Design a protein around this ligand. Structure first.
Ligand SMILES: CCCCCCCCCCCCCCCCCC(=O)OC[C@H](COP(=O)([O-])OCC(O)COP(=O)([O-])OC[C@@H](COC(=O)CCCCCCCCCCCCCCCCC)OC(=O)CCCCCCCCCCCCCCCCC)OC(=O)CCCCCCCCCCCCCCCCC
Ligand SMILES: CCCCCCCCCCCCCCCCCC(=O)OC[C@H](COP(=O)([O-])OCC[N+](C)(C)C)OC(=O)CCCCCCCCCCCCCCCCC
Ligand SMILES: CCCCCCCCCCCCCCCCCC(=O)OC[C@H](COP(=O)([O-])OCC[N+](C)(C)C)OC(=O)CCCCCCCCCCCCCCCCC
Ligand SMILES: CCCCCCCCCCCCCCCCCC(=O)OC[C@H](COP(=O)([O-])OCC[N+](C)(C)C)OC(=O)CCCCCCCCCCCCCCCCC
Ligand SMILES: CCCCCCCCCCCCCCCCCC(=O)OC[C@H](COP(=O)([O-])OCC[N+](C)(C)C)OC(=O)CCCCCCCCCCCCCCCCC
Ligand SMILES: CCCCCCCCCCCCCCCCCC(=O)OC[C@H](COP(=O)(O)OCCN)OC(=O)CCCCCCCCCCCCCCCCC
Ligand SMILES: CCCCCCCCCCCCCCCC(=O)OC[C@H](COP(=O)(O)O)OC(=O)CCCCCCCCCCCCCCC
Ligand SMILES: Nc1ncnc2c1ncn2[C@@H]1O[C@H](COP(=O)(O)OP(=O)(O)O)[C@@H](O)[C@H]1O
Lengths: 114, 72, 125, 187, 230, 98
């Protein structure tokens, strides 16, 4: 339903001339117009909201979209590292580095601290 | 006001328009433990804090606290 | 101020558009090399201009004898060439102050009679 | 227009050519292109200085644009190889230089402008990319083999070779039951 | 297009009335403390004493213009007027009249008249001379034509608001294009030349004196069409 | 919130602004010009010369169109335009922030 209603090969302004018709007073008349009365309510998100809230304080704009309805607001996502969560390899590089970190920390705690 | 929102790849761990549902509990469990850590650091550091005398106090030059020169 | 037409001796890339280079130095690998296959082993086609820039400096060379002095600026080249001499002379002038005062001098001090820093000196039965 | 006048080490002549005409080599342009581009540039600069300026005077703006329009109509009428047309071009190029303003307003809709590239738009390739199966389901058979090709596993994202020999459960039963049964049947 | 009526707690024009001080809207109602309401309510102002005071002690209707055609008194029994300045002339007169009150008053009142003069000198030379004074010197209060002499009498405002008239031969008048003087006197036209017409400047070749005509000045069709000036 | 599933760019319609409104506003701007005589004769398929826009009047109309639409049009694009159809198409498909 992304087709656009655009009129081609037909005039869009019905005025014969700018001087003879008082366009400067009455403006231009429209022909072949696709009238669409849109009564969308700005501040709908603000309707019935407490004063001390994010919507009123910061996001009190004309046509703000709520997170629950905004389809491009992201929840936390992505992979922390390049390692596959479901990997069948008995890989031990991560374990080796974790062991190095832990043993270094333990040596500091048990031999050096204090 | 701001720029128009555009899709962000799911696989990419980025902060573009990230909002967390559990942010209340996350804040609760990130604030108080940090407060306790800072309290421990503060009480540890207070042992090595120095303050000048109060309004009605004077430092006796012969008291041990008074500065002492090196004795060769 | 630097422009390609009037630089003369301070060389730089010309602003005029040019056709891509037909032949240029490229990456080459040792025979029977094991390919690098990180992150799915996806290789993109390299840009000719970028590869040419990558390998141009390594292969650049002086055309004639003595071109180095003239290239760029003679005064700056001579100053760079004499920099080690300037450093040595500054060090000696500074050491004059040390000699006349009594401070640290540029010498291999031998306070320790060959005794290394925190070395273990022991004897065996 | 790319609005890159103050970047890429343009000389003054090149910047003047860019301001007066969209190109850095006006010689390539024809007579009509030269005249129209110069007229557009002059009108743009006059609007910038005498409409969107400091205490601008609209009556003076109207008079100035009218005079410029008459002059440019005469210029267009004139032949390309005329000293009078050359004088007109020099006059209006000098006017452009005189009105040249460092830090002049650059519209945000043009390339190389302030805020031009504040955001990196991700392509459908990145959007689809999902080597692991959390967001886009991942087949146990890594890929779908195509006809006229062998069935090979996809190269993993992480190609570390720090892998142990295959691990098995403790006390794993691995006796060759098939061979034992066949041998028992043979007797 | 307005949807404020759909909500009971939405703002109203009664809530916006307080902005009428900072916002221009046609009057809706009269408050009890308005000047109009006070005057129409308090019976004191209805007294014939106050009414007669209003009628007499204020600007008179006699000086109010009554037509779009003005025939000022002739300067000479045989001359006819052509141009006359209405408002800028009076403003310049009142400004130059300050030199007869502020200046002696400043001398006799200020503790440091030399300090006042030292401050005024650079003030005059920058942002004041070109701003008002030179324009006033070259300003034409009135212009008439004497046909027997074939001359034009021009009235000008002098120091302290004094008015003096001078004669110039019609044969010595020339038109000076604004392009020839814009660069010479950019500052003058920048800050003080707005009142007078830029493209209608004339000068006397013999005496080298300019004539500035007010933009909001009245011209006489008959005077312009007289053969002497054409 | 965006779904956890993979979502791709949705090019709904190439127009980033209502093309009908863009065309009507451009036609009104053109009709405002003195050289233009009959606003009725103007259509999206009408060429500038036939509607009466001279080559020099075209640059004035295009500058005012840039001011009206809050965008900057390059000389190359303005010269490539051949009809009101092309003009409105380019303006409507233009992302006002480039
Ligand atoms: C030994 C006694 C010391 C004490 C006494 C007092 C000091 C006397 C020192 C001598 C000064 C006079 C002689 C210098 C002549 C110029 C150099 C030269 O001959 O090379 C050829 C000369 C330079 O060729 P080039 O460098 O290839 O040209 C580049 C192009 O111009 C394209 O250029 P660009 O547009 O790309 O821009 C690059 C430009 C600009 O580059 C930069 O911006 C980068 C920085 C460059 C270095 C700037 C100087 C920094 C400080 C240096 C300190 C050195 C300390 C170590 C040495 C100590 C020695 C005691 O590069 C240059 O600077 C080139 C100009 C020449 C060099 C000038 C700077 C070094 C001069 C020597 C200073 C020595 C100071 C000693 C005392 C120090 C304090 C104790 O060629 C020319 O003749 C062309 C014209 C160049 C401009 C000349 C300007 C006038 C100079 C004076 C003329 C009259 C001289 C009369 C002499 C009489 C008999 C003694
Ligand atoms: C024992 C006492 C306390 C111990 C604590 C020790 C703390 C040591 C320091 C930790 C630094 C942590 C940095 C985390 C950065 C995370 C990424 C990020 O921010 O976004 C990057 C952004 C965008 O990141 P992104 O959104 O693409 O990705 C975020 C998620 N990841 C990274 C996981 C994919 O990229 C940048 O532009 C780089 C910005 C870097 C800014 C770094 C600022 C550090 C300022 C610290 C001030 C501290 C003051 C100290 C005063 C006292 C000193 C004695
Ligand atoms: C931008 C600021 C720049 C600041 C200036 C930077 C440095 C400039 C150059 C300094 C030169 C100093 C020269 C004197 C020191 C000599 C040291 C020495 O003993 O070497 C002997 C050396 C050998 O030293 P040696 O190491 O064999 O000595 C034996 C060992 N000792 C000494 C320990 C016993 O003999 C030489 O070859 C010297 C050659 C000198 C050639 C002529 C140099 C003239 C320099 C003139 C400079 C301009 C005047 C001064 C300007 C500043 C005034 C404030
Ligand atoms: C090193 C040397 C330093 C020298 C520094 C010199 C500083 C002193 C300069 C003196 C300037 C003198 C100016 C004279 C002004 C008159 C000139 C002239 O002819 O104009 C006639 C003009 C024009 O004359 P007209 O003939 O064209 O018309 C008559 C007036 N109208 C236009 C209304 C019809 O007439 C006047 O302005 C009359 C002014 C009368 C009052 C003058 C004094 C007023 C100030 C009094 C003292 C201060 C207030 C005290 C209050 C006390 C209260 C208790
Ligand atoms: C002696 C030769 C003739 C000198 C003529 C006098 C100078 C030219 C005419 C000046 C007319 C403006 C007088 C304004 C007086 C304001 C009150 C005052 O401070 O008077 C006493 C003071 C002086 O009285 P004083 O000397 O007793 O003050 C004590 C001394 N001081 C102030 C330095 C500590 O007035 C002034 O300082 C006037 C300075 C000269 C102004 C020159 C023109 C520039 C201003 C344009 C006019 C509008 C100014 C509006 C100012 C409003 C308030 C900030
Ligand atoms: C003196 C006069 C001052 C006058 C100031 C006037 C205003 C100044 C300008 C505004 C500045 C502050 C703005 C704060 C806005 C807060 C808005 C808000 O609280 O909204 C309610 C919201 C509920 O959550 P929700 O609606 O889901 O959020 C998404 C909405 N899109 O969120 C909430 O309910 C908030 C609470 C969330 C949960 C918090 C959990 C605890 C967090 C740690 C608390 C630590 C306290 C430590 C105290 C130590 C004491 C010693
Ligand atoms: C040491 C002097 C200190 C200051 C003295 C101030 C005297 C003021 C009274 C001047 C009376 C004579 C005026 C003659 C006019 C004329 O025809 O002047 C004609 C003269 C001569 O002609 P040209 O110089 O143009 O060739 O023009 C001048 O510029 C020279 C005289 C300047 C007089 C300026 C007077 C106004 C001063 C305003 C001060 C700043 C504003 C103060 C608040 C309003
Ligand atoms: N490698 C380069 N070397 C020298 N000059 C360059 C280089 N790249 C760009 N320039 C400069 O960039 C400008 C051209 O910018 P560009 O992004 O190529 O757009 P366009 O070529 O269409 O004008 C020229 O002044 C040109 O001199």
């Amino acid at each position: 339903g992304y087709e656009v209603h655009l009129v081609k090969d037909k005039n869009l302004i019905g005025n014969k001339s700018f001087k003879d018709d008082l366009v400067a007073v009455y403006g231009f008349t429209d022909v072949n117009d696709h009238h669409h009365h849109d009564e969308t309510d700005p501040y709908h998100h603000l309707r019935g909201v407490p004063t001390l809230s994010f919507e009123r304080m910061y996001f009190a704009d004309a046509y703000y979209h709520d997170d629950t309805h905004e389809g491009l607001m992201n929840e936390p996502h992505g992979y922390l590292t390049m390692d596959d969560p479901m990997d069948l390899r008995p890989n031990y590089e991560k374990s080796a580095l974790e062991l190095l970190f832990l043993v270094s920390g333990g040596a500091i705690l048990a031999l050096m601290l204090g | 006001g701001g720029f128009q929102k555009y899709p962000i790849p799911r696989y990419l761990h980025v902060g573009q328009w990230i909002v967390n549902k559990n942010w209340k509990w996350n804040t609760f469990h990130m604030f108080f433990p940090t407060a306790i850590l800072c309290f421990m650091v503060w009480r540890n550091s207070m042992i090595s804090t120095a303050k000048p005398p109060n309004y009605g106090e004077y430092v006796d030059p012969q008291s041990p606290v008074a500065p002492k020169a090196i004795k060769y | 101020n630097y422009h390609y037409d009037f630089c003369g001796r301070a060389y730089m890339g010309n602003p005029a558009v040019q056709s891509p280079p037909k032949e240029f130095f490229n990456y080459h690998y040792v025979p029977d090399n094991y390919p690098d296959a990180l992150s799915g082993f996806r290789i993109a086609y390299r840009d000719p201009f970028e590869v040419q820039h990558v390998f141009a400096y390594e292969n650049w060379e002086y055309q004639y004898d003595g071109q180095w002095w003239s290239m760029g600026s003679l005064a700056c080249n001579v100053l760079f060439f004499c920099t080690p001499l300037f450093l040595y002379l500054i060090l000696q002038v500074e050491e004059l102050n040390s000699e006349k005062r009594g401070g640290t001098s540029n010498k291999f001090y031998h306070n320790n009679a060959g005794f290394f820093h925190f070395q273990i000196y022991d004897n065996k039965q | 227009s790319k609005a890159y006048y103050f970047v890429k080490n343009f000389s003054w002549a090149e910047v003047s050519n860019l301001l007066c005409y969209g190109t850095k080599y006006p010689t390539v342009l024809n007579h009509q292109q030269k005249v129209t581009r110069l007229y557009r540039a002059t009108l743009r600069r006059v609007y910038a200085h005498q409409v969107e300026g400091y205490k601008t005077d609209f009556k003076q703006y109207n008079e100035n644009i009218t005079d410029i329009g008459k002059d440019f109509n005469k210029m267009l009428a004139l032949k390309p190889e005329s000293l009078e047309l050359q004088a007109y071009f020099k006059k209006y190029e000098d006017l452009q230089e005189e009105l040249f303003d460092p830090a002049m307003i650059i519209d945000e809709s043009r390339p190389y402008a302030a805020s031009s590239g504040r955001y990196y738009i991700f392509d459908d390739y990145l959007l689809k990319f999902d080597p692991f199966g959390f967001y886009s389901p991942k087949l146990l058979s890594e890929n779908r083999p195509e006809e006229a090709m062998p069935f090979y596993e996809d190269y993993p994202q992480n190609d570390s070779h720090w892998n142990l020999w295959e691990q098995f459960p403790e006390d794993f039963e691995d006796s060759n039951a098939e061979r034992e049964a066949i041998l028992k049947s043979n007797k | 297009g307005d949807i404020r009526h759909k909500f009971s707690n939405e703002i109203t024009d009664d809530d916006y009335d307080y902005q009428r001080a900072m916002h221009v809207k046609p009057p809706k109602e009269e408050s009890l403390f308005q000047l109009t309401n006070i005057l129409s309510s308090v019976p004191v102002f209805k007294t014939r004493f106050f009414l007669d005071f209003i009628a007499r002690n204020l600007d008179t209707n006699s000086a109010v213009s009554t037509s779009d055609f003005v025939a000022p008194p002739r300067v000479h029994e045989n001359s006819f007027f052509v141009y006359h300045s209405r408002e800028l002339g009076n403003v310049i007169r009142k400004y130059r009249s300050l030199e007869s009150i502020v200046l002696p008053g400043a001398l006799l009142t200020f503790t440091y008249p030399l300090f006042a003069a030292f401050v005024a000198i650079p003030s005059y030379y920058f942002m004041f001379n070109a701003k008002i004074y030179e324009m006033s010197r070259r300003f034409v209060v009135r212009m008439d034509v004497l046909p027997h002499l074939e001359m034009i009498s021009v009235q000008r405002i002098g120091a302290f608001g004094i008015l003096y008239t001078k004669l110039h031969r019609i044969q010595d008048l020339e038109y000076v294009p604004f392009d020839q003087v814009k660069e010479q006197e950019n500052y003058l036209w920048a800050i003080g030349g707005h009142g007078v017409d830029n493209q209608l400047i004339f000068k006397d070749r013999s005496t080298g004196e300019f004539f500035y005509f007010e933009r909001q000045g009245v011209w006489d069709a008959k005077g312009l069409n007289h053969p002497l000036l054409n | 919130y965006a779904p956890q599933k993979v979502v791709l760019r949705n090019e709904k319609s190439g127009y980033y602004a209502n093309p009908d409104d863009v065309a009507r506003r451009l036609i009104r701007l053109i009709s405002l010009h003195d050289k233009v005589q009959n606003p009725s004769a103007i259509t999206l398929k009408s060429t500038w010369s036939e509607i009466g826009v001279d080559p020099l009047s075209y640059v004035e109309i295009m500058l005012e169109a840039e001011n009206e639409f809050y965008i900057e049009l390059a000389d190359e694009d303005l010269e490539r335009f051949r009809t009101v159809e092309d003009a409105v198409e380019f303006i409507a498909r233009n992302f006002f922030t480039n």
